């Protein structure tokens, strides 16, 4: 699209398809990256797992394949840990290994089993376990009604509190996930599976269970830290379709026993394109983030791009507190970001009225724009991204139902797939000030879109004209008097 609708600071594969991103591991000083990856770029490809380095998260060294399909078995999603201790041993005393756990799809058969692979080089290489798989179709098949062909995407960390490893295997349409302990990180016991009809306030319209993750969470703040599993359900989202979920409860190391949930505030995303999200482990306490991405694309193949397809989320922390009074997962794009953004217009304190129009200077493609603002009763503030003569896709927040919508009817090419264009929406209430934020990632084909503290997020792919790269910002029904304005520039050097 002159240059096939490529992100500028998103990352994006060197060449061909890439799906869920896979063993998010902080190895020394590089955050480390892999994902699904498709070179042969048509649906019938073989998947193995990319890889990708960076030291802030947003600058991406491209790296070789660090897992491969060979023999023929895929290398499905997974997960990766330190073993410092050598429990596998794998690696030695001087040279601990870094391990990865793998579903391993033989493609004949569709058969799903579990892998492992190790790294003694700091994540350099990866060389797959010779006594692969670690668990078989045959130890599956007692908790597998399949017998071996829906158990897949291994979860794995060491519970300190128990001293065993740990794994979180999905199990699809069976809408269950198991857990495993091992010593070892070889040999692997059964213990417990956690359904769907143990849930409090899961919908049973929530199954396909993919793509499990597991951590302990700060609740805040008040010292209490709690477990989180995350997950991407195949269906049950706000957009429709797959879409990514979080859960607190209690782990003992063999069961995981969940809180209840609300499904106002258990999903992480409110548009189509967050699926398969992973965070980074061994980050030190230090930093003490938990830093997740997904990937954008819940269009298949249907994506109007060429030499790449699927693009992953910007990174963002996921953090628990509270917004006044309730208890939420809140999001928001990491503080590395603003070391590559510079200003291109601020407002402060600034009224806006019915038929004025501001931002009408800007020109990008690549932006992060924040908005906070006091709406009167009956406004409906509107910001218009990527806008052209006849492109836009508009922020909206309408003051009297308190809700943030995003709307692509009109923002490019939405003839690629049927979910395309349409409006999504998030509730977002003014805080105890007053106070509506809004914050937006614009991208060459992205919109990330954020509210408040981050309890409301909906992130969408757009495919506008290279040329609609203006901004509108107006409002409706009343007047609203912008607190701050920040549009911002991004750039990666």
């Not at 892999?34 to 030291?55: D, L």
């Not at 992060?368 to 909206?396: C, H, M, N, W």
């Not at 990330?448 to 409301?456: L, R």
Request: net charge negative; hydrophobic share 35%.
């Amino acid at each position: 699209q002159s240059n096939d609708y490529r992100p500028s600071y998103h990352f994006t594969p060197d060449q061909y398809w890439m799906n869920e991103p896979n063993g998010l591991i902080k190895i020394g000083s590089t955050w480390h990256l892999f994902f699904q990856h498709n070179p042969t770029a048509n649906v019938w490809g073989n998947i193995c797992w990319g890889h990708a380095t960076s030291t802030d998260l947003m600058h991406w060294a491209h790296k070789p394949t660090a897992i491969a399909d060979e023999n023929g078995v895929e290398a499905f999603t997974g997960t990766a840990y330190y073993d410092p201790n050598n429990t596998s041993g794998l690696g030695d005393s001087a040279n601990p290994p870094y391990l990865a756990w793998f579903t391993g799809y033989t493609t004949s058969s569709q058969t799903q089993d579990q892998r492992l692979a190790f790294s003694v080089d700091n994540g350099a290489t990866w060389t797959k376990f010779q006594g692969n798989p670690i668990i078989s179709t045959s130890q599956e098949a007692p908790h597998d009604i399949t017998g071996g062909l829906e158990s897949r995407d291994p979860k794995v960390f060491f519970h300190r509190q128990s001293g065993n490893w740990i794994m979180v295997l999905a199990h699809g349409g069976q809408d269950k996930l198991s857990f495993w302990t091992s010593a070892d990180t070889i040999n692997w016991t059964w213990q417990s599976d956690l359904k769907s009809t143990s849930i409090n306030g899961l919908s049973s319209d929530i199954t396909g269970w993919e793509v499990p993750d597991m951590f302990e969470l700060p609740v805040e703040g008040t010292e209490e830290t709690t477990w989180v599993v995350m997950m991407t359900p195949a269906e049950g989202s706000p957009a429709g379709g797959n879409g990514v979920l979080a859960i607190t409860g209690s782990f003992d190391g063999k069961s995981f026993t969940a809180d209840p949930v609300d499904a106002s505030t258990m999903w992480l995303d409110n548009g189509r394109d967050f699926d398969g999200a992973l965070s980074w482990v061994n980050v030190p306490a230090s930093d003490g983030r938990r830093i997740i991405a997904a990937v954008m694309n819940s269009y298949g193949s249907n994506p109007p791009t060429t030499t790449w397809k699927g693009m992953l989320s910007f990174p963002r922390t996921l953090s628990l507190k509270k917004v006044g009074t309730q208890q939420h997962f809140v999001q928001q794009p990491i503080t590395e970001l603003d070391t590559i953004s510079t200003s291109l217009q601020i407002l402060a304190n600034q009224t806006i009225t019915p038929g004025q129009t501001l931002l009408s200077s800007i020109r990008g493609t690549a932006l992060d724009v924040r908005v906070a603002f006091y709406p009167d009763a009956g406004s409906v503030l509107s910001l218009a991204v990527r806008k052209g003569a006849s492109e836009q896709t508009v922020i909206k927040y309408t003051q009297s139902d308190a809700t943030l919508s995003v709307d692509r009817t009109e923002s490019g090419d939405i003839s690629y797939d049927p979910a395309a264009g349409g409006v999504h929406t998030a509730k977002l209430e003014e805080d105890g000030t007053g106070l509506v934020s809004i914050r937006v990632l614009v991208d060459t084909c992205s919109v990330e879109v954020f509210g408040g503290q981050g309890e409301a997020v909906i992130s969408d792919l757009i495919f506008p004209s290279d040329s609609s790269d203006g901004l509108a910002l107006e409002v409706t029904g009343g007047n609203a008097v912008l607190q701050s304005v920040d549009v911002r520039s991004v750039s990666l050097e």
